Amino acid sequence: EPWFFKNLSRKDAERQLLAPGNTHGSFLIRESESTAGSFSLSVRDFGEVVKHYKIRNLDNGGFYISPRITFPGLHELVRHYTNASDGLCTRLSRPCQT
């Protein structure tokens, strides 16, 4: 998945998203370096800032950022927030470019 980044800290994710070639809505998902199975979504917004969202785990293996809408997988979460912001700072646009 072009949006999933391996072995990144929060500050690494921030630097990657603030790099030239990214813009409003540029995003990635990473795993916590400290907590196995805990994922987060990082999104570039506009000074120019990166917002982080905790992806919460359902016992059945699904995911949510807001309890209003849950997803059976990260692909479905990304597709949903690519369609509309639905409570995030902005609509997801392009996966983080390296």
Ligand SMILES: [Cl-]
């Ligand atoms: Cl959050």
